[PDB]
A paper describes a structure:
The RAS–RAF–MEK–ERK signaling pathway (ERK signaling) regulates mammalian cell growth, proliferation, and survival. Activated RAF proteins subsequently initiate a cascade of phosphorylation and activation steps of downstream kinases MEK1/2 and ERK1/2, which then phosphorylate an array of proteins leading to specific cellular effects. [name] mutants are found in up to 9% of all human cancers and over 50% of melanoma. Our structural findings based on co-crystal structures of Ponatinib and PHI1 highlight that each inhibitor recognizes a distinct allosteric site and induces distinct dimers and αC-helix conformation.
To gain further insights into the mechanism of [name] inhibition by Ponatinib, we determined the BRAFV600E-Ponatinib co-crystal structure at 2.1 Å resolution. In this complex, Ponatinib is well-defined in electron density and binds deeply into the [name] inter-lobe active site cleft. Ponatinib induces the DFG-OUT conformation and forms an extended network of hydrophobic and polar contacts, reflecting its nanomolar activity. Its pyridazine group establishes hydrogen bonds to hinge residues and the methyl and trifluoromethyl moieties occupy the hydrophobic and type-II pockets, respectively. The amide linker forms additional hydrogen bonds to the catalytic E501 residue, which however maintains the catalytically important salt bridge with K483, a signature of active [name] conformation. Interestingly, the activation loop of the kinase domain is partially disordered, whereas, its experimentally determined portion adopts an orientation that docks residue E600 to a unique position compared to other inhibitor-bound BRAFV600E structures, most likely a result of Ponatinib binding mode. In this binding mode, apart from the previously defined “adenine”, “hydrophobic”, and “type-II” pockets, Ponatinib forms extensive interactions with an allosteric site defined as back-pocket IV (BP-IV) according to Kinase-Ligand Interaction Fingerprints and Structures (KLIFS) database. Indeed, a comparison of Ponatinib binding mode to known [name] inhibitors illustrates distinct recognition of this allosteric site by the methyl-piperazine moiety of Ponatinib. These interactions include a bifurcated hydrogen bond with the backbone carbonyl oxygen atoms of αΕ-β6 loop residues I573 and H574 and hydrophobic contacts with R575. The [name]–Ponatinib structure corroborates the dimeric conformation of the kinase induced by αC-IN inhibitors, with both protomers occupied by Ponatinib. Interestingly, Ponatinib induces an intermediate αC-CENTRE position in both protomers, which compose a perfectly symmetric dimer (crystallographic dimer).
Residue numbers in the entry:
A (entry chain A), B (entry chain A): 446 to 600, 614 to 722
The structure:
């Protein structure tokens, strides 16, 4: 039952504020070591806010994997809050797009590989991320990928990871395993090029229209010269405009693991 | 309910055998990346073996902390098995007592600190380890302590970590939070001296008798010259012959965290 992960009031020490976001405000904290606490920052949660809290706790409780941010518990007083492990360092987004760090290809592949492990796990439990993007991939201790859904803005933007069908939305719910695969394709692009797609287009509404219609797609000729050819091909497959031509994660993971195994 | 963490048959790939032990046989495996699988290696589990399996799953399910080995799931077919994350490297025992590695003091303190985090967490949930010893402290990636209860023999032996009251056993069940604190004291000794206590005594039965009676205790004059004085004092307190003079983990952890914070 849910109360097994309830942390009684008074035990958590809230420290430095990290950021407010779409899912609450995040702090560093102490509770049997370092933790992160995401607070619903709100005077009277409505029943919808309560349901959403419950939903996040419910899904996080189903995850036990080294590449999924570790859920540790929740509290309902002093306020609504979710507690996770504390990750040191910063996001993949931060490393690629807003830092002097340039990773070696082995490391780039290892990041890809870990990210694929996490996603394969989530898909195996029928969990659809919907917000996979480099800013939701934390490089804990610069080494271990932790996927989360942090809701913190970068230093929609996020429309860069959306599959064509997600942008078009001609049915109610266009999200799927295959849409997460597309987003993962865009993370691969980021890794293998160092860049965000469509850097030479300055109108987010044209990017939206054009990706939706199939007239614009990421320029794969930009991948670095030492990107393995099978990586570039997998990326192309993850980015297929037609949802059902994209591969599934078990195959994605196996093929990346094969690339990583060869580079010693 | 328990079945939420059941992994269906066929999904796990069992690889290299690691060791048989007191709690089953351990293999490296693949399941959405690397895992360890501990197999009950047995043709017809008795009801006691089944209960013990359930007990291990039940306790491991209550743990979500970065310094407790991550439980991931179990199977009941092909055989009884528990699945955890795969730890790279080796045990603390291995590093201190059977390797060329000599750690710096900062690192030794950080190991102490992480181990204290894990133990404080387990005690906060009323979990008594009973087998805390350096061979049950894994240094994952040489950096992150993962406490488990692996049951694998080293390259009782384990009587070295037993508090006097545990050896004497004048009541049925001499185990407690305070007995885990003593064992942690002996891990501190290992860290700060590089050695097992009582290396100049070759009769395990005399060590047993004498620790039980209070006539023999670890020689703390052996700690390395750069061991902080407050560390040496905490170790002395964790090793108190009288159970109730030993500190609790919240205090143990706070004082180690204070030592670690000062060394930058
Ligand atoms: C305190 C906290 C609480 C919660 C979460 C959080 O990630 N929530 C989460 C919600 C849902 C899902 C899965 N769903 C996605 C939606 N989808 C519709 C359904 C499936 C997942 C996922 F991991 F499974 F992806 C995570 C993160 C933080 C953090 C933190 C933290 C830790 N270190 C640092 C360092 C700097 C900054 N922050 N930080
Ligand atoms: C597959 C597997 C399954 C289970 C366990 C296991 O640790 N079980 C466990 C049972 C009980 C308890 C707590 N109780 C102690 C008793 N006490 C009476 C009650 C409280 C805990 C603890 F972590 F909480 F301590 C752990 C470990 C392995 C492993 C592995 C593995 C992973 N990487 C490697 C690399 C090399 C070798 N092995 N390996
Ligand atoms: N990082
Ligand atoms: N290690």
């Amino acid at each position: 039952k849910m109360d097994d992960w309830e942390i009684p009031d008074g035990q958590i020490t809230v420290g430095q504020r990290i950021g407010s976001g779409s899912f609450g405000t995040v702090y560093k904290g102490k509770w049997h070591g370092d933790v992160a606490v995401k607070m619903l920052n709100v005077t009277a949660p409505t029943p919808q806010q309560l349901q959403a809290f419950k939903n996040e706790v419910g899904v996080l409780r189903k995850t036990r994997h080294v590449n999924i941010l570790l859920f540790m518990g929740y509290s309902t007083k002093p306020q609504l809050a979710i507690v996770t492990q504390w990750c040191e360092g910063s996001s993949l987004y931060h490393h690629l797009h807003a830092s002097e760090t340039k990773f070696e290809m082995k490391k780039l592949i290892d990041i890809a590989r870990q990210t694929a492990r996490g996603m394969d796990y989530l898909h195996a439990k029928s969990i659809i991320h919907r917000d996979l993007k480099s800013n939701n991939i934390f490089l804990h201790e610069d080494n271990t990928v932790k996927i989360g859904d942090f809701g913190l803005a970068t230093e929609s933007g996020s429309i860069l990871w959306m599959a064509p069908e997600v942008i078009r939305m001609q049915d109610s719910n266009p999200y799927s395993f295959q849409s997460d695969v597309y987003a993962f394709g865009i993370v691969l692009y980021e890794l293998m090029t160092g860049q965000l797609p469509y850097s030479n287009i300055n109108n987010r509404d044209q990017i939206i229209e054009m990706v939706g219609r199939g007239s614009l797609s990421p320029d794969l000729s930009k991948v670095r010269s030492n990107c393995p050819k099978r990586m570039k091909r997998l990326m192309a497959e993850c980015l297929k405009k037609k949802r059902d031509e994209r591969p599934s994660f078990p195959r994605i993971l196996a093929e990346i693991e094969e690339l990583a195994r060869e580079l010693s």
